[PDB]
Design a binder for this molecule. Sequence first.
Ligand SMILES: [Mg+2]
Lengths: 50, 100, 49, 279, 218, 195, 50, 55
Amino acid sequence: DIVLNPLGVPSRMNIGQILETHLGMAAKGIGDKINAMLKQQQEVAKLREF
Amino acid sequence: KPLVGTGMERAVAVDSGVTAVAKRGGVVQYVDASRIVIKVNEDEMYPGEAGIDIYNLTKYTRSNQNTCINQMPCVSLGEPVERGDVLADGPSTDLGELAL
Amino acid sequence: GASVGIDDMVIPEKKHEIISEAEAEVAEIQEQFQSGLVTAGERYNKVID
Amino acid sequence: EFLKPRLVDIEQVSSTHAKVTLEPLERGFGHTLGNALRRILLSSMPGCAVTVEIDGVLHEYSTKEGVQEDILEILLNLKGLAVRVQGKDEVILTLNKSGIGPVTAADITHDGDVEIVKPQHVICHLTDENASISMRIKVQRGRGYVPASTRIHSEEDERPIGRLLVDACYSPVERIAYNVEAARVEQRTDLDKLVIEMETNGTIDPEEAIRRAATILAEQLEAFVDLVRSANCLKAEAIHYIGDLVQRTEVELLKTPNLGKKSLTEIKDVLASRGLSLG
Amino acid sequence: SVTEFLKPRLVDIEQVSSTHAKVTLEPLERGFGHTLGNALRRILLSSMPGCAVTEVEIDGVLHEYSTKEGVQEDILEILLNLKGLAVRVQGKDEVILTLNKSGIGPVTAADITHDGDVEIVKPQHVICHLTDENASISMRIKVQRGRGYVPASTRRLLVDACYSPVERIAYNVEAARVEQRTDLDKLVIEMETNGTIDPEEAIRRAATILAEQLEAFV
Amino acid sequence: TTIKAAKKMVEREEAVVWDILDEVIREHPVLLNRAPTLHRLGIQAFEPVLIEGKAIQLHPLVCAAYNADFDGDQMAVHVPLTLEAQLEARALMMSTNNILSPANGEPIIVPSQDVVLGLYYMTRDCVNAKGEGMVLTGPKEAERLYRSGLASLHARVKVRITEYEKDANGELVAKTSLKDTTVGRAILWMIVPKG
Amino acid sequence: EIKELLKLGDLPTSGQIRLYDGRTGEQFERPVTVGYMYMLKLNHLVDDKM
Amino acid sequence: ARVTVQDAVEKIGNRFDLVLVAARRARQMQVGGKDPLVPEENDKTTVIALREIEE
RNA sequence: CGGAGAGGUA
Ligand SMILES: [Mg+2]
């Protein structure tokens, strides 16, 4: 969706946009594993364990 | 609903006036795009002819900076509401959480 | 495609050893000033160095 | 000397998730064809999308009674409606329901040449038995993305207050995932396969999309060469077009009993602008 | 109008004197500029029929780091003049030639044996320089037919055969405006050849090859 | 026919007035200027290029003179009218005529932040890469080799170049030899001029 | 803890993935960082400034 | 393509009288209909005038 | 087709 300039990070030292980018991808990966268990039928027993 | 937050999103959203916090608890009797009707409990009702609670959600209006200011209900019929719960999401609000 | 990640900023392996050695020096060189050997002005010009 | 590819297999993980395979492929032709087909499947692919008039509304910024959602929100979720039409290119659906309960896509009309891909697509929610909703969903067919803001010509026709324009997003393809890899031995090495993994909103067929993008690609590669009373008075004399009436002078038209007083006055008014009836 | 795509009108075709052209396709749709421009670019370099030099051996040298008296160049240097040579070959697959000559002066492509079907396109191309009246040069050049570029490590001295008869290609998408529309591409293709085939005809070659790869679908 | 007729034509925006506007825009320079005009290099002349949208495009090489980044900066446009004003825009304040600062003879068209990194990647020289230790017949063969995915951009390879030298009295001696270089540096040589 | 969160779902622990070109179908070297960042839209539009 | 005026100003090293002589010359081309001493490629009087003084 | 004050952008 967005193509940012990577050279703007070392000039103005704002690393919080690098950890949020990694943490935001991690948060989406836990939302894709549940979406897979919701797109197809899955018992609540499997959803309560993951 | 930003995935990466600091936990201070509900505090700003609830303390602001853009949302519609439930005054007294109960069960949603009639939800609507512009009105909210919740049947208050037997204890939370005043002794002499208390009745119910009615929340009139604001429609599309303009702000000081010419921005849209409208609310949207986030409840359903039969859902038991407790005192302090959020009943509507105004501008930049997602289920009682700030989202800009 | 020259990106920038969290692993592209490597911390030196002996950084912890230099800081631990530095705080150990200050923990005893400050007490040498309290004995009346050096003044507070010259000690200030020494800790910053 | 080139082993042309063939449509070998078409997998089907679900009603939306597909996986096609293109083999055999030569050296440097996997990425050459994989990218070229991806750039067409995403850009231009025909589809259908909602382009709708509700009874008790005047604009999308209003609000109706007995509906939990908002009028603009209703126009927002109607955008994501998977419709499939094979007969014509312009259909008008209808949605009528009353009583407490959600309003899904099943409740919409059951036209013969209209197939609903996701009947459980929630569109609205009713919250009062003494309420009802009635709308006419005008579905069309096109390609690409066309916003409602571009429909400001105001030189073709005018729309009533009841009409509500919606953003047209008739593009069934969502994402394309091809991947080149080494094929089997085939008694000849240096042969690679192309495994395309597409995904759509159940409104198109995998084969019907690859045979269509390749057609568009070949259609561009061919550029490889060097270089009524007034009108009834004139229609009585078998004259329907303005050219037949303008061929004769106004004096010749006035010498006939077929022309009336109103027709002669209308012809004189049109002739005053030096546009017609100039002898 | 669901399948009514615009067609480019190549109104301008400017080319340098001999082996350099510049084609400008206009107008194209949005996104087809890079689509079509790159499709033929990858094919032109990686899959293009042609003949080049594959291996040349010296009658008295069996090592890369050697030298022959009376030659102003080196044995490593004369390999380039064999690579840059452009030769058109008949339907025959391969054929070996020679460079048997003893004389003072630069060795041009005209000194190579005719060998019948072998037709040198650049007789002015110089292979090496000779200065002694008795220093004789002799080698065995072996041509071969292929498609693309084959380095030495992918494979008597080895020669990196450049079968592709195109020296370079670099397209350039631009903006073209219809009466009302403006966000439409404007492809500009720049390409140089090696003199074997004209660049104008070189486009029709790869475009036909790509058109034949889409017969099972259209 | 009359002045009023032309106004209504532009008012309705016919499809013909666009090809008529392209006529005057072709050779009519305009002046661009930002708010903090400190030196004279803040008002230059450019040739307008019609583009769809509501934003102005400024060449990323004159941003150093204007001292304008792309975080919300705005500039003001000016159109000369008379013949003298148009000629002064081309002969005195044209963007291709003001490349040296009035304070020092050093250039002011230095690119940065994407051009100096890119050329540094081509001119880089790796130790072990695909294609190391080969021979190329010039810069044109290097471009064919790299785009084909057969060799890396940074790999040592002996390449023959023909570098002209105009140091004589108009004559250009065409020195030809075999220099030791990489793939990236060879492809960049196709841009360097003769002299 | 971010890397451990990237190990629950099937995601690369390094954080940087390998992307392909969209106009040439080529593979970019030096695999880039791709994630999910929360961007905002300031009330500075070009329609109120042109 | 009137990209630069280097070769123009090298002949007459003033850069001020050039604008003056070109303004008068281009005015005689526009004000009164005439054929430019040089061929035209759909240019204006300003470009044609500067192109004429090039020689 | 104004005068002061406040806030914001480069
Ligand atoms: Mg700025």
